Amino acid sequence: FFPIEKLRNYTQMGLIRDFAKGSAVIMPGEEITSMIFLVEGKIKLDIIFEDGSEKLLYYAGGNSLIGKLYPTGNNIYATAMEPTRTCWFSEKSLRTVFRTDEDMIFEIFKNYLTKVAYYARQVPTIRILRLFYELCSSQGKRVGDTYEITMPLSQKSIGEITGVHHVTVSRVLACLKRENILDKKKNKIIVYNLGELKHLS
Amino acid sequence: NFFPIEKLRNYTQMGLIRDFAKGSAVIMPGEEITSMIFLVEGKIKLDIIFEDGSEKLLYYAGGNSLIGKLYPTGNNIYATAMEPTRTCWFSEKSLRTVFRTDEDMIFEIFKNYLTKVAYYARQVPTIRILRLFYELCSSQGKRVGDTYEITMPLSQKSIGEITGVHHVTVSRVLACLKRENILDKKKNKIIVYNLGELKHLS
């Protein structure tokens, strides 16, 4: 949640909006321009990617801060998971705060910073040729200077298995190919240069 | 996306200018940073270290990026100026100056910062592993009674690479199958003790 309690002393500078259990909290592109400090309760922020798709992002426990003070590249769609109470902070209430006490400036920074740390700490190609070498070096059965693996394993499945976005499972499988490194010809995997796999892996 | 915050160029005087010839550690490893660093010319690779001396690259930073931090963060940072680079350092006591001189910046950063979380979160799951085995099984599995038996190495680590998966999970996940009863990975042997429920969960 990365709660920022300190701020509950400060909600009276806010717009308190209570929401029922399911009622959409940020719309999928209702335009949102304020920090939504979440005081009792819980919220599910998913992103709607621009295809139409769905995909979780992160929950918001009590005390957490969600929202934003800007248009910020993405469509959020967040549901109240349980009858939840929230205090909205416009920039101008937000201002009003900092004037009433600096420390909170930092307070949010901290909270943001942390959040950066966090997600950025977590954050392809090799995860691929790792999967392949794995297979080649177990299932590998020599055919002259290449090695054959008698298994379908289709683009979709490398994606799934590698947690890798298709355009990449393509480009790279394309590139493994173009290199006399690897054919996944329909049924069977033919590895032309194993030393070069191991090494890129 | 060196999420530059050009506005900050206007207040470097409230800051601390620290210059950094190429190759030079802008962030030593486990040296403690309590200042926003503001990149006023140049280019840094930030790396991290996992608590297991592992290294991998955190971001770049470019003309007008803000890296650095005002607090502890339980991350292990190693920045080096690729190019010769002018920085400028924001202690709190100093940003605390800037925000009085100029209360607007408080939002120009909050934006700034608020935005990378977008970014990152947007980029950013047990699924895979199973799935990894699942294909691995359906293709290689040699059914020994109710079990399906492949002969491979699968170093806990390789899985964590293959699958963009944190070691705790890989670990805490071979934990949850070998238990559950699904899968045992015991040395040079896969031994799936339930393909049906294996694909239910995938």
Numbering used by the authors:
A (entry chain B): 19 to 141, 149 to 226
B (entry chain A): 18 to 141, 149 to 226
Quote the original article:
The transcriptional regulator CprK from Desulfitobacterium spp. induces expression of halorespiratory genes upon binding of o-chlorophenol ligands and is reversibly inactivated by oxygen through disulphide bond formation. The CprK associated with the o-chlorophenolacetic acid (OCPA) reductive dehalogenase (CprAB) from D. dehalogenans and the closely related D. hafniense has been shown to bind OCPA with μM affinity leading to sequence-specific DNA-binding, and ultimately transcriptional activation of the associated cpr gene cluster. Members of this family are homodimeric and contain an N-terminal sensor domain linked via a long α-helix (involved in formation of the dimer interface) to the C-terminal helix–turn–helix (HTH) DNA-binding domain. We here present crystal structures of the oxidized ligand-free (3.2 Å) and reduced ligand-free (2.0 Å), OCPA-bound (1.8 Å) and DNA-bound (1.8 Å) D. hafniense CprK in addition to an intermediate OCPA-bound structure obtained by soaking ligand-free crystals (2.0 Å).
Crystals of the oxidized, ligand-free wild-type CprK were difficult to obtain and only yielded data to low resolution (to 3.2 Å) using microfocus beamlines. Nevertheless, the relative position of the individual domains could be unambiguously determined and is roughly identical for the three individual dimers present in the asymmetric unit. It thus appears that considerable flexibility in the DNA-binding domain positions, and presumably in the entire molecule as a consequence, is lost upon oxidization, confirming the previously observed effect of limited proteolysis as detected by mass spectrometry. In case of CprK, oxidation leads to severe constraints on the position of the DNA-binding domains and hence a reduction in overall flexibility. Furthermore, while it does appear to not significantly affect ligand binding mode (13–14 and this work), it prohibits formation of the appropriate inter-domain contact network that establishes the DNA-binding form, thus inactivating transcription under aerobic conditions.
